[PDB]
Amino acid sequence: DFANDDIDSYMIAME
Amino acid sequence: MVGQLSEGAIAAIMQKGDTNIKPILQVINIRPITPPRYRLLMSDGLNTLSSFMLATQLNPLVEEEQLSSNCVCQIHRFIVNTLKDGRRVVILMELEVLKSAEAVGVKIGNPVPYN
């Protein structure tokens, strides 16, 4: 789980 | 072996937002976010950056194990999405795996996280 930040949530919300 | 990677491409993406380049990068790690969405930690030899996302259309490259940790690939099309806080997400649209994970075998060089 590298870089477990809030970027995951952003990439989910994309597209 | 670091001469095989596009040293400085991560800084160019993060400073210039260049999308015309076709950088050669090493996959350091791939992890699914929960139909999976893959987030990639990539290296250009000099730096790593963790905000790469695989377009869904490239998921077969992961599913057939062509794209996996330690492989080297060349990006043929990507999009940048700059967040309100200034971080940049790099969406990989098209790429070619140049050297398999098995053939490379290890992280190339000693890249440090971009800042």
Residue numbers in the entry:
A (entry chain B): 297 to 311
B (entry chain A): 1 to 34, 39 to 119
Show passages lifted from the paper:
The heterotrimeric Replication protein A (RPA) is the ubiquitous eukaryotic single-stranded DNA (ssDNA) binding protein and participates in nearly all aspects of DNA metabolism, especially DNA damage response. The N-terminal OB domain of the RPA70 subunit (RPA70N) is a major protein-protein interaction element for RPA and binds to more than 20 partner proteins. The RPA70N domain adopts an OB fold with a five-stranded anti-parallel beta-barrel but has very weak ssDNA affinity. Its primary role is to mediate protein–protein interaction with its basic and hydrophobic groove and a side pocket, as first shown by a series of studies of RPA70N interacting with p53.
Previous studies showed that RAD9 directly interacts with RPA70N through a CRD motif (checkpoint recruit domain) in the C-terminal domain; mutation of the CRD motif affected RAD9 localization and ATR checkpoint signaling. We fused the CRD to RPA70N and crystallized the fusion protein in the P3221 space group. The C-terminal part of CRD forms a short two-turn helix, while the N-terminal part adopts an extended conformation. RAD9 D297, D301 and D302 interact with RPA70N R31, R43 and R91 residues, respectively. RAD9 F298 inserts into the side pocket, as observed for HelB and DNA2. Several hydrophobic residues from RAD9 (I303, M307, I308 and M310) pack with hydrophobic residues at the bottom of the RPA70N groove. ITC experiments showed that RAD9 CRD binds to RPA70N with a KD of around 20.5 μM, but mutation of F298, M307 and I303 resulted in a substantially higher KD value. The RAD9 F298/M307/I303 triple mutant pulled down much less RPA than did WT RAD9. In addition, mutation of the conserved arginine residues in RPA70N (R31, R41, R43, R91) disrupted the binding of RPA70N to RAD9 peptide. Our results, in combination with those of previous studies, lay out the details of RPA70N/RAD9-mediated 9-1-1 clamp complex recruitment to DNA damage sites.
